[PDB]
Amino acid sequence: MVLSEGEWQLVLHVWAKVEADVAGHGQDILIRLFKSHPETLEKFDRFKHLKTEAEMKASEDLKKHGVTALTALGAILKKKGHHEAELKPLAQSHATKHKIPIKYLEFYSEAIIHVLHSRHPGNFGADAQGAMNKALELFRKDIAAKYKELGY
Numbered sequence: 001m002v003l004s005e006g007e008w009q010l011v012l013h014v015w016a017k018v019e020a021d022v023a024g025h026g027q028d029i030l031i032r033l034f035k036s037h038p039e040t041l042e043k044f045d046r047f048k049h050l051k052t053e054a055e056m057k058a059s060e061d062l063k064k065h066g067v068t069a070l071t072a073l074g075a076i077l078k079k080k081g082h083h084e085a086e087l088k089p090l091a092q093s094h095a096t097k098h099k100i101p102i103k104y105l106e107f108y109s110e111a112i113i114h115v116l117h118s119r120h121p122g123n124f125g126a127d128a129q130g131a132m133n134k135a136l137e138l139f140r141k142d143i144a145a146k147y148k149e150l151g152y
């Protein structure tokens with residue numbers, strides 16, 4: 001899998017819209033992740049005390065973490081697949097410190113795609129959803145290969 005230039009344009013066009021409100025996107029994505037997949041919340045010592053959606057929405061610290069995560073993702077996307085240097089540290093921490101299964105990265109991808117669809121219907125039609133899925137799959141494929149190297 002390599003994305004075409006066309007596919008990259010679609011991804012980065014929608015991403016530039018996300019960047020108008022990184023914090024609101026990060027909140028919506030983590031919340032969707034935690035509600036859809038409660039096991040994910042449990043990996044976060046920082047957030048596992050949050051028991052309701054309203055509590056999640058009211059946490060400034062969760063918003064802060066959403067900004068962190070999305071900002072790293074944005075830097076990866078803008079490398080258009082040349083993201084070896086960005087991925088290495090992220091794979092290392094996620095495999096060896098945070099203990100995040102690959103499957104949980106698939107759930108994370110699903111959350112991103114869902115939120116982009118809610119917030120950007122006109123810039124996120126089928127073609128753009130496809131391209132974004134391909135980009136997120138490429139990310140996951142590469143992280144997975146690092147996990148295997150490390151024996152996760």
Ligand code: HEM
Binds near residue numbers: 040070108
């Ligand atoms: C698009 C996928 C993801 C990106 C870009 C991302 C990004 C980040 C970044 C940039 C950090 C801070 C630096 C570091 O520790 O490496 C971080 C920390 C962390 N990530 Fe992720 N992450 C992703 C997926 C996940 C998922 C799916 C989970 C759990 C289901 C997870 C759990 C965590 C945890 C527990 C921390 C440590 C948070 C703390 O206690 O401060 N991440 N992530």
